[PDB]
A paper describes a structure:
The structures of gD1 and gD4 revealed the existence of a common V-set immunoglobulin-like (IgV-like) core comparable to those of other gD homologs. The cores consist of a nine-stranded (A′, B, C, C′, C″, D, E, F, and G) β-barrel, arranged in a typical V-like Ig fold, flanked by N- and C-terminal extensions with loops, α-helices (α1, α2, α3’, and α3), and small β-strands (str2-4).
Glycoprotein D4 was crystallized with one protein per asymmetric unit. In total 244 residues could be modeled (R34 to R277). In the structures of gD1 and gD4, six cysteines were found to form three disulfide bonds at sites conserved in members of the gD plolypeptide family: C87/C209, C126/C223, and C138/C147. Apparent dissociation constants ( Kdapp ) of 7,000 ± 2,000 nM and 5,800 ± 760 nM were calculated for gD1 and gD4, respectively. Additionally, the receptor affinity of a C-terminally truncated EHV-4 gD, gD436-280, was tested. The truncated gD4 version, gD436-280, exhibited a receptor binding affinity to MHC-I in the same order of magnitude (6,700 ± 750 nM). That the C-terminal truncation had no significant effect on the receptor affinity of EHV-4 gD suggests that the mode of binding differs from other alphaherpesviruses, however, the role of the C-terminus remains to be determined.
Numbering used by the authors: 34 to 277
Amino acid sequence: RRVVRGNQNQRPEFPPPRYNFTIVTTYNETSLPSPFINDQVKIVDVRTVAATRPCEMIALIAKTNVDSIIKELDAAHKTYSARLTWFKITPTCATPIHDVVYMKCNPKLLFGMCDERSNILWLNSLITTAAETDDELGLVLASPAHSYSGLYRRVIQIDGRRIYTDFSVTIPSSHCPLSFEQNFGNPDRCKTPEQYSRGEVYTSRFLSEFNYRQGVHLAWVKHWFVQDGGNLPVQFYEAQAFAR
């Protein structure tokens, strides 16, 4: 288990928690449904994202209809379970890079505001340069390398409904010395359509936990990016307005 270690006087400021949840580190797993689209037709929101300078921090963000599904369960007066999974997708295989399972979700509230969740899973080589956005549905990527270029797919599962968003990402060719190479295409983590179909993909077997709430994880990712020389885009600043 990854833990953050070091002197208190080197911490960033942490925004207050959004929702007090319990990580059920012992919950027993189900295989990952295939992210490939074949026999179940889906509408997909397709976005494009391009970094314009080396080591640029970027965010994969797109409004979805997730609330219209959550609030259908509210009108039914049903709590629900959910799953969030990010993939890097190629025609031959798909690599899950972030995966979370949610239980006892109150549909009066927003996505992710659920009493329980699984371990919060990440590709281990992304933990210091990646985190969720504030509503837990976006992905922040610090110091990408050129090899990050390609197709990213987010699958949100709410009860028995699924939402797909694709991001076509371009990163320029100059080298970023702050980056980590993810080797996204490695067959240990890049799983074929057949492997998903046969029910054989279990994220606990190859992703790693970073069981810190979003506000703490992103605060650290932004702090480490700047302390290593990165130029933080104003998009990732917080509002102080007139206060303090």
